[PDB]
Amino acid sequence: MITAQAVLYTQHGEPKDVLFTQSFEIDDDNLAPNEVIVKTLGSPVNPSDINQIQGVYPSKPAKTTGFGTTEPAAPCGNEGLFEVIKVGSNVSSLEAGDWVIPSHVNFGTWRTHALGNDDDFIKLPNPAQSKANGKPNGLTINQGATISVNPLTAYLMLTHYVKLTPGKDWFIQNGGTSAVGKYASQIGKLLNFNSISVIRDRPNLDEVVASLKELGATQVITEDQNNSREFGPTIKEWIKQSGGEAKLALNCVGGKSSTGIARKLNNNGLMLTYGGMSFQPVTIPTSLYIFKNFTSAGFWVTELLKNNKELKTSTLNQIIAWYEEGKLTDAKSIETLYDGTKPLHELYQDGVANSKDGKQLITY
Amino acid sequence: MITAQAVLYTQHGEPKDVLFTQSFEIDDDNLAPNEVIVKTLGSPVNPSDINQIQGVYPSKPAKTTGFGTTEPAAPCGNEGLFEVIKVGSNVSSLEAGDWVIPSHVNFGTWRTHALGNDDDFIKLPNPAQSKANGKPNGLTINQGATISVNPLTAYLMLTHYVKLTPGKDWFIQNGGTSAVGKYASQIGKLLNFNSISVIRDRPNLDEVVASLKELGATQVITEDQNNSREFGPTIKEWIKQSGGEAKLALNCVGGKSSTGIARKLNNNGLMLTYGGMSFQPVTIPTSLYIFKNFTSAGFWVTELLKNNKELKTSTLNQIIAWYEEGKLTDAKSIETLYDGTKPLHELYQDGVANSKDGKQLITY
């Protein structure tokens, strides 16, 4: 028997008010033929995790007595890296020591262990396997724990909707320093797509600009530059010199920022909105729709892949390969190790409260 | 020889400042085999005609010395109804007395006569022909003169993009009392599509609502009601009871109104923006794009029908037939007859200045 800990809530609200830690047992000596028991290695705090707890997210884990609690309760977290510790008699796809991520959302990753079916997980190579197989690198725990949403989102937005001609065409995106923004710059570099990253100004602008260009952004401009009508000629010249067109805009800000990047696309452009800044609607001038054949659509990785495991598999495999090859890098998470000296839910509450410092990863 | 008058400009600007009238000759005794001479019956003043003259509309007639001017000059007007006066030796598609409209935009319709090739025109049945064909009605001069922009726009937005299930599905539109809005309500009724028209509140609201429902709007609400999610219950029920879904939103307003109609669509909805009320961008909540698979795109009949003669042909044919069959009605225009006592360009300048009074049609 294993004694596990899970972060739960019986009522929606701010994480700081409703979360608590529940101890529960998993019987590793009584596994059904297709069952698997995993131990969590690390799981991040993402905005969607927080929105589910707040009760304002379209998809949420069902409440249950499953973790034994006194009163219906729901688990937290959708992303995370786990390691198989034991499998049932009919399990062949997974073995002890294998690294896995959940195959579906609402898994409840803010906990120490989980019991599921082999098909509730997707295997990733662990460092030992990558190294034994001759790869230059193995995935880090943060890379594995955060591989399921952000890297796939950047890859899919850049390749699944419009075909950018290598060396010539451009995409433009705001939220340039976001996790997805940084993955998109790298994927653009790897696939030879030109790109303009728009970012908020900051005290260390030059350092940030150099960093994004090294990741792969062709040009980096501030939101002030994005707002400048007088800057239009420079952008047009960048595009003219490459012999391509700006065909795709990635928006995660809305408001004036979305207006600015939409205006920089050539005729027949597509904008994909995949995030938004708290109560800032996507704002597009009427003229772009009428005269520039502009289209504005959405992107939600969860919905896109729900019934396309193959597309998901192919995408995940490419991100895994690039990590092993040392061609892709993650932004570093601030890691907080759970050692039992502080309640697990408190580590996540601090994570939620400190999200402004950087991505928070609770490790085990 | 025929002496004709044309409204021209040598430089873009406001109609009241840049228009003038040029007298020019057409030699009706020297027609090439495929040429035809037409005499204008009527041509309207549309926003696009005005924007073209202002220099803020991207599709425009080239400035040429064709009218015998000292400097290159551009003609004005994109739609209009003409009567064929004489045809060349190799013309068989048209004969004297036939009614025609330009086959392409940028022809210049604010003038008394024109010389062109037979394929620069599309034949419409004249009243005598409709009568001889046993039809209950023939087209009026206003119906023929205004057939190529607004009716085609309403018809194509409703049929060319998303397929609404007859007797079940819905479209919602703002600008409900606009010319296109009124055509859309009628075409919706003919296609058996349910619809909600959103209009501005006004003094004789009950009368307006009744008139729009008679035209074909299933339900009519005001912008205040469109903004009141507290009124939103009344709308969700209408759709539920019908058994269909709201799949298409037609927007010509932007701003808060565009947000309101977008929110009323079911998942996988499409918004087409075909107009906008001065510097009021199309504003759509981020959540509709991400969680409701919402898409917003544009509509411009000029670009859609460029290089698509068959689509234009079949659409025009259906509108013509509907007028003949008494199934479609146009809003009445304020008609100003050109008798030669006042410069032609002045009649059009007055038409531009008085467009708020109603559609201005200059007749001959």
User: Left (φ > 0), alpha (ψ -120 to 50) or beta: where does B79 sit?
Assistant: beta
> Do B8 and B112 share a domain, yes or no?
yes
Provide the residue type at B70 as one letter: T
Record the tokens describing residue B125, joined without a space. 């049945």
- Same domain for A170 and A142, yes or no, is no
Statement to judge: residues A8 and A128 lie in one domain: yes
Method: X-ray
- Taking 3-state DSSP, the helix, strand and coil percentages for chain A, each rounded to the nearest 5, stand at 35, 25, 40
| Pair B97, B165 in one domain | no
Check if the beta carbon of residue A36 is closer than 8 Å to that of residue A84. yes
β partners of residue B122: B101
Question: Residue B180 contacts by C-beta under 8 Å, 6 or more apart in sequence?
Answer: B150, B153, B154, B250, B252, B274, B275
A286 contacts in B (CB within 8 Å)?
A: 254, 273, 275-276, 280-282
Query: Among A259, A282, A289, whose Cβ lies nearest the Cβ of B289?
Result: A282
Nearest to A298 among B254, B259, B294 (CB): B294
Claim to verify: residue A127 and residue A258 sit in the same structural domain: no
Nearest CA in chain B to A274: B290
Counting Cβ atoms within 10 Å, is residue B30 exposed (0-12), middle (13-18) or buried (19+)? exposed
A231/B contact by beta carbon, under 8 A = no
Residue A161 tokens read as 């909707």
In angstroms, the CA A338 to CA A226 distance is: 43
* Terminal CA-CA length for chain A: 19
B-contacting residues of A 112-171, CB under 8 Å? none
Whether B281 and A259 lie within 8 Å, measured CB to CB: yes
Strands A2-9 and A74-75: antiparallel
CA distances to B261, B264, B267, B297 from B254, rounded to whole Å, are 10, 15, 20, 13
Angle B205-215/B179-191 helices, nearest 10 degrees? Answer: 50
Task: Annotate A59-115 with DSSP letters as a single string.
Answer: --PPPBSTT--SS-BEE--S--EEEEEEE-TT--S--TT-EEEESSS----SBSEEE
Interface test mutation site (partner B, options A56, A105, A289, A305, max chain B beta carbons within 10 A):
A289
- What is the token pair recorded at A143? 């890379």
Number of residues that make up chain A: 364
Q: Are B48 and B121 in contact (CB under 8 A)?
A: no
Please choose, from the candidates A361, A353, A354, A343, the residue with its C-alpha nearest in 3D space to the C-alpha of residue A7.
Answer: A343
The helix-helix angle for A309-325 and A150-159 (nearest 10°) equals: 110
Distance CA A311, CA B256 (A): 38
| Dist. CA A348–CA A16, nearest whole Å | 9
- Please enumerate in sequence order all residues whose Cβ is within 8 A of that of A19, keeping only pairs 6 or more positions apart, or say none: A7, A8, A9, A53, A76, A345, A348, A349
Q: Which residues of B touch A293 (CB under 8 A)?
A: 298, 300, 303
Cα A81 to Cα A340: distance, rounded to the nearest angstrom: 19
Angle at B345 between CA B340 and CA B350, to 5 degrees: 100
Cβ B274–A290 below 8 Å, yes or no? yes
Q: Which amino acid is at A256?
A: K
Q: Token pair for residue B221?
A: 């609400």
Tokens 């001479």 belong to B37
A2 at B interface, C-beta within 8 A: no
Q: Rounded to 5 degrees, what are φ and ψ at B306?
A: -75, 135
Amino acid at the residue A145: A
Q: Does B170 appear as a known binding residue? A: no
- Chosen for mutation from A258, A274, A290, A307 (greatest number of chain B CBs closer than 10 Å) is A290
A170-173/A246-251 β-pairing: parallel
Q: Of A185, A249, A193, nearest to A211 (Cα)?
A: A185
CB A192 within 8 A of CB A212: no
Sign of CA dihedral B176, B182, B183, B187: positive
Q: Which of A58, A281, A292 sits opposite B286 (nearest CB)?
A: A281
Residue A78 and residue A156 in one domain: no
Q: Are strands B295-298 and B194-199 parallel, antiparallel or unpaired?
A: unpaired
The total domain count for chain A is 2
The reply to whether A39 and A105 lie within a common domain is: yes
Contacts of B276 in chain A (CB under 8 A): 286-287, 290
Strands A246-251 and A270-273: parallel
CATH number at residue A157: 3.40.50.720
User: Which helix H or strand E contains A5, and what residues bound it?
Assistant: strand A2-9
Taking CA atoms, A101 is separated from A41, A126, A317, B34, B222, in Å, by 10, 12, 13, 73, 50
CB atoms within 10 A of CB A210: 12
CB atoms within 10 A of CB B230: 8
Do B68 and B171 lie in a common domain? no
Residues contacting residue A267 through CB under 8 Å, at least 6 positions apart: A292, A293
Spatial separation of the C-alpha atoms in residues B7 and B77, rounded to whole Å: 9
Q: Do B284 and A296 touch (CB under 8 A)?
A: yes
Tell how strand B99-102 and strand B121-124 pair up.
antiparallel
For residue A42, give Cα distances in angstroms to A100, A111, A122, A312: 11, 9, 16, 22
What is the DSSP secondary structure assignment for residue A333, as one 8-state letter?
P
Contact A75, A67 (CB under 8 A): yes
A57 flagged as catalytic: yes
Cβ of A300 and B291 within 8 Å? yes
HEC states along B293-335? CCEEEECCHHHHCCCCHHHHHHHHHHHHHHHHCCCCCCCCCEE
Two tokens, residue B160: 């060319």
The residue ranges of DSSP E strands in chain B, in sequence order, are 2-9, 20-26, 35-45, 74-75, 81-87, 99-102, 113-117, 121-124, 170-173, 194-199, 219-222, 246-251, 270-273, 282-284, 295-298, 334-337, 360-363
Cα separation, A184 vs A214, whole angstroms: 13
Give CA–CA dist A84/A89, Å, rounded: 14
- Please give the residue range of the domain that contains residue A154: 148-328
Q: How far apart are CA A200 and CA A183, in angstroms?
A: 18
Name the resolution in angstroms. Answer: 1.7
Q: Residue B354 is part of a domain; what is its CATH number?
A: 3.90.180.10
- Rounded to whole angstroms, the Cα distance separating A242 from A225 reads 21
Q: Residue A145, SS3?
A: helix
Q: How crowded is residue A3: how many other Cβ atoms within 10 Å of its Cβ?
A: 10
What is the widest separation between alpha-carbon atoms in chain A? 70
β-strand pairing of B246-251 with B270-273:
parallel
To the nearest whole Å, the CA of A295 is away from the closest chain B CA by 5
* Residue B150, marked binder: yes
Measured in whole angstroms, how far is the alpha carbon of residue B30 from the centre of its chain?
35
Q: Are residues A273 and A300 in the same domain?
A: yes
Q: Give the Cα separation of A308 and A304 in Å (integer).
A: 7
**Beta carbons within 8 Å of B98's beta carbon, 6+ residues apart:** B83, B84, B123, B126
As a whole number of angstroms, the distance between CA A298 and CA A42 comes to 30
Which residue out of B9, B57, B161, B338 is catalytically annotated? B57
DSSP label at residue A120: G
CA distance B201 to B224: 8
A302 close to B (CB below 8 A): no
Burial class from Cβ neighbours inside 10 Å (0-12, 13-18, 19+) for residue B343 reads middle
Chain mean position to CA A155: 11
B274 assigned to a ligand binding site: yes
Q: Which residues of A touch B303 (CB under 8 A)?
A: 291, 293
Contact B67, B5 (CB under 8 A): no
Is the Cβ pair B289, A280 closer than 8 Å?
Answer: no
Question: Do A353 and A278 lie in a common domain?
Answer: no
Q: Tokens for A115, please give them.
A: 């019991």
Q: Which of A281, A283, A247 is nearest to A264 (CA)?
A: A247
- Give the Cα separation of B61 and B64 in Å (integer): 9
Given CB atoms, is B303 within the 8 Å cutoff of chain A? Answer: yes
DSSP class of residue A160 equals S
Question: Does the CA dihedral A269-A274-A275-A281 come out positive or negative?
Answer: positive
Amino acid at residue number B195: S
Instruction: Give the chain B residue nearest A297 (alpha carbons).
Output: B295
Q: Are residues A35 and A121 in the same domain?
A: yes
| Distance from C-alpha of A195 to C-alpha of A180, rounded to nearest angstrom | 14
Per the listing, tokens 């025929």 go with B2
Indicate the burial class of A198 (C-beta count within 10 angstroms; 0-12, 13-18, 19 or more): buried
Q: What is the DSSP string of B170-199?
A: EEEES-TTSHHHHHHHHHHHHHT-EEEEEE
Quick one: B323 and B194 in the same domain?
yes
Q: Which of A9, A57, A338, A348 is catalytic?
A: A57
Rounded Cα distance between A68 and A89, Å, is 26
Measured CA distances, B125 to A165, A346, B91, B102, B121 (Å): 49, 80, 17, 14, 13
Q: Which residues contact A108 (CB under 8 A, 6 or more apart)?
A: A6, A61, A74, A75, A76, A77, A114
Smallest Cα–Cα separation from B312: which of B151, B126, B118? B151
CA angle A90, A92, A96 (to 5 degrees): 105
Chain B stretch 172-191, residues whose beta carbon is closer than 8 A to a beta carbon of chain A: none
Amino acid making up residue B59? S
Size of interface A-B (CB pairs under 8 A): 94
3-state DSSP call for residue A42? Answer: strand
Q: What is the DSSP code string of A168-233?
A: T-EEEES-TTSHHHHHHHHHHHHHT-EEEEEE---TTHHHHHHHHHHHT-SEEEEHHHHH-GGGHH
Cβ proximity of A191 and A166 under 8 Å: yes
